[PDB]
DNA sequence: GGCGACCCGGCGCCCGCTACGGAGTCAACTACGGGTAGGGGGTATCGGGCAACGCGGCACTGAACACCGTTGTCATGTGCCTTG
Protein backbone atom coordinates (compact mmCIF):
# COMPACT_ATOMS: atom_id res chain seq x y z
CA UNK A 1 0.00 0.00 0.00
CA UNK A 2 0.88 3.69 -0.25
CA UNK A 3 -0.99 5.02 2.80
CA UNK A 4 1.17 3.13 5.31
CA UNK A 5 3.31 5.60 7.26
CA UNK A 6 6.92 4.55 6.73
CA UNK A 7 8.45 4.42 10.25
CA UNK A 8 11.77 5.70 8.90
CA UNK A 9 10.10 8.74 7.35
CA UNK A 10 7.98 9.33 10.46
CA UNK A 11 10.92 9.27 12.88
CA UNK A 12 13.03 11.39 10.52
CA UNK A 13 10.23 13.97 10.32
CA UNK A 14 9.84 14.00 14.11
CA UNK A 15 13.58 14.57 14.51
CA UNK A 16 13.32 17.33 11.91
CA UNK A 17 10.52 18.94 13.92
CA UNK A 18 12.61 18.79 17.10
CA UNK A 19 15.74 20.19 15.44
CA UNK A 20 13.78 22.97 13.74
CA UNK A 21 12.08 23.93 17.00
CA UNK A 22 15.42 24.00 18.82
CA UNK A 23 17.02 26.14 16.10
CA UNK A 24 14.10 28.57 16.29
CA UNK A 25 14.49 28.68 20.07
CA UNK A 26 18.12 29.64 19.49
CA UNK A 27 16.87 32.79 17.77
CA UNK A 28 15.26 35.62 19.72
CA UNK A 29 11.74 35.10 21.07
CA UNK A 30 10.00 37.64 18.83
CA UNK A 31 11.99 36.60 15.75
CA UNK A 32 11.22 32.92 16.30
CA UNK A 33 7.54 33.68 16.89
CA UNK A 34 7.13 35.79 13.76
CA UNK A 35 8.96 33.33 11.50
CA UNK A 36 6.95 30.43 12.95
CA UNK A 37 3.71 32.30 12.25
CA UNK A 38 4.96 33.15 8.75
CA UNK A 39 5.51 29.41 8.20
CA UNK A 40 2.94 27.81 10.51
CA UNK A 41 5.30 25.81 12.69
CA UNK A 42 2.62 25.87 15.41
CA UNK A 43 -0.46 25.63 13.16
CA UNK A 44 -0.93 24.09 9.73
CA UNK A 45 -1.89 27.46 8.18
CA UNK A 46 0.97 29.96 7.84
CA UNK A 47 -0.10 33.58 8.23
CA UNK A 48 0.99 36.08 5.62
CA UNK A 49 2.78 39.21 6.75
CA UNK A 50 -0.06 41.60 7.58
CA UNK A 51 -1.91 38.69 9.15
CA UNK A 52 1.07 38.28 11.45
CA UNK A 53 0.87 42.04 12.04
CA UNK A 54 -2.41 41.92 14.01
CA UNK A 55 -1.84 39.74 17.08
CA UNK A 56 1.71 41.10 17.49
CA UNK A 57 0.78 44.77 17.04
CA UNK A 58 3.35 45.58 14.34
CA UNK A 59 2.79 46.84 10.81
CA UNK A 60 2.62 44.76 7.65
CA UNK A 61 6.05 46.15 6.68
CA UNK A 62 7.82 46.07 10.05
CA UNK A 63 6.89 42.39 10.17
CA UNK A 64 8.24 42.01 6.63
CA UNK A 65 11.63 43.43 7.55
CA UNK A 66 12.03 41.38 10.71
CA UNK A 67 10.95 38.25 8.82
CA UNK A 68 13.64 39.02 6.24
CA UNK A 69 16.21 39.45 9.01
CA UNK A 70 15.15 36.10 10.48
CA UNK A 71 15.62 34.46 7.09
CA UNK A 72 19.06 36.05 6.78
CA UNK A 73 20.06 34.90 10.27
CA UNK A 74 18.83 31.35 9.63
CA UNK A 75 20.74 31.33 6.33
CA UNK A 76 23.89 32.01 8.36
CA UNK A 77 26.28 29.01 8.31
CA UNK A 78 25.81 28.67 12.08
CA UNK A 79 22.19 27.46 12.10
CA UNK A 80 22.42 25.58 8.79
CA UNK A 81 24.79 22.63 9.26
CA UNK A 82 22.20 20.63 11.22
CA UNK A 83 19.30 21.46 8.91
CA UNK A 84 21.19 20.78 5.66
CA UNK A 85 21.22 17.01 6.19
CA UNK A 86 17.41 17.01 6.59
CA UNK A 87 16.68 18.71 3.24
C1' DG B 1 -45.33 -46.93 13.17
C1' DG B 2 -41.25 -46.79 15.58
C1' DC B 3 -37.12 -49.42 14.39
C1' DG B 4 -33.78 -50.14 11.04
C1' DA B 5 -30.39 -50.13 7.91
C1' DC B 6 -29.01 -47.60 4.48
C1' DC B 7 -28.85 -44.06 2.07
C1' DC B 8 -27.81 -39.98 1.28
C1' DG B 9 -26.43 -35.50 1.86
C1' DG B 10 -23.40 -32.66 3.80
C1' DC B 11 -19.93 -31.40 5.75
C1' DG B 12 -15.00 -31.15 8.08
C1' DC B 13 -10.31 -31.40 7.69
C1' DC B 14 -6.31 -32.54 5.03
C1' DC B 15 2.70 -30.44 8.87
C1' DG B 16 5.71 -25.82 8.47
C1' DC B 17 8.00 -21.67 6.44
C1' DT B 18 10.67 -19.21 3.04
C1' DA B 19 11.55 -18.85 -2.06
C1' DC B 20 9.91 -19.77 -6.98
C1' DG B 21 7.47 -19.46 -13.81
C1' DG B 22 4.36 -16.81 -16.84
C1' DA B 23 -0.42 -15.94 -18.51
C1' DG B 24 -4.73 -12.63 -19.25
C1' DT B 25 -9.01 -13.05 -24.59
C1' DC B 26 -15.77 -13.56 -28.98
C1' DA B 27 -22.05 -10.94 -31.00
C1' DA B 28 -26.99 -2.16 -32.03
C1' DC B 29 -28.15 2.31 -33.03
C1' DT B 30 -29.41 7.37 -33.44
C1' DA B 31 -31.61 11.43 -32.06
C1' DC B 32 -32.27 14.83 -28.75
C1' DG B 33 -31.71 17.75 -24.81
C1' DG B 34 -29.75 19.46 -20.99
C1' DG B 35 -26.28 20.62 -17.92
C1' DT B 36 -21.73 21.01 -16.51
C1' DA B 37 -17.61 22.42 -17.56
C1' DG B 38 -14.12 24.64 -19.99
C1' DG B 39 -12.25 29.07 -22.00
C1' DG B 40 -11.14 34.08 -21.79
C1' DG B 41 -12.57 38.92 -19.94
C1' DG B 42 -12.65 41.86 -16.83
C1' DT B 43 -12.51 43.47 -11.78
C1' DA B 44 -12.15 44.14 -6.49
C1' DT B 45 -8.95 42.82 -3.13
C1' DC B 46 -4.72 41.49 -0.93
C1' DG B 47 0.67 41.77 -0.77
C1' DG B 48 5.13 43.40 -1.81
C1' DG B 49 8.87 47.79 -2.24
C1' DC B 50 10.99 52.64 -0.43
C1' DA B 51 12.45 57.18 2.80
C1' DA B 52 10.88 59.91 7.09
C1' DC B 53 10.07 59.24 11.19
C1' DG B 54 9.57 57.51 15.72
C1' DC B 55 12.85 57.14 19.72
C1' DG B 56 17.27 57.70 23.48
C1' DG B 57 21.67 58.62 24.98
C1' DC B 58 24.16 61.91 25.18
C1' DA B 59 25.76 65.78 23.65
C1' DC B 60 26.14 70.30 22.55
C1' DT B 61 23.95 74.74 23.22
C1' DG B 62 27.13 77.02 26.54
C1' DA B 63 23.83 80.21 28.33
C1' DA B 64 23.17 81.35 32.54
C1' DC B 65 24.02 81.18 36.32
C1' DA B 66 26.28 79.41 40.87
C1' DC B 67 30.98 77.90 43.89
C1' DC B 68 34.92 78.65 45.88
C1' DG B 69 39.26 81.36 45.09
C1' DT B 70 41.49 85.42 44.78
C1' DT B 71 44.26 90.50 45.35
C1' DG B 72 40.71 94.34 44.61
C1' DT B 73 39.84 98.25 48.35
C1' DC B 74 38.82 100.92 52.07
C1' DA B 75 38.38 103.70 55.89
C1' DT B 76 40.64 103.21 59.84
C1' DG B 77 43.97 101.43 63.44
C1' DT B 78 49.91 101.03 65.74
C1' DG B 79 54.74 103.34 66.03
C1' DC B 80 57.96 106.98 65.61
C1' DC B 81 58.93 112.13 65.67
C1' DT B 82 57.98 116.91 66.95
C1' DT B 83 56.15 120.19 70.14
C1' DG B 84 53.34 121.29 74.44
UniProtKB/Swiss-Prot annotation:
Residues 23-76 are annotated as: Sigma-70 factor domain-4. Residues 49-68 bind DNA. It comes from the Bacteria. Disulfide bonds: none annotated. Sigma factors are initiation factors that promote the attachment of RNA polymerase to specific initiation sites and are then released. This sigma factor is the primary sigma factor during exponential growth. Its activity is stimulated by RbpA. Belongs to the sigma-70 factor family. Homotrimer (Potential). interacts transiently with the RNA polymerase core complex. Interacts with RNA polymerase-binding protein RbpA via its sigma-2 region (residues 211-347) in a free form. This is RNA polymerase principal sigma factor HrdB. It comes from Streptomyces coelicolor (strain ATCC BAA-471 / A3(2) / M145). The gene is hrdB. The chain holds residues 424 to 510 of 511 of the full protein.
Amino acid sequence: DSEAVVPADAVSFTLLQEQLHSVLDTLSEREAGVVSMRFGLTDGQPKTLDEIGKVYGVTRERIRQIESKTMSKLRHPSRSQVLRDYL
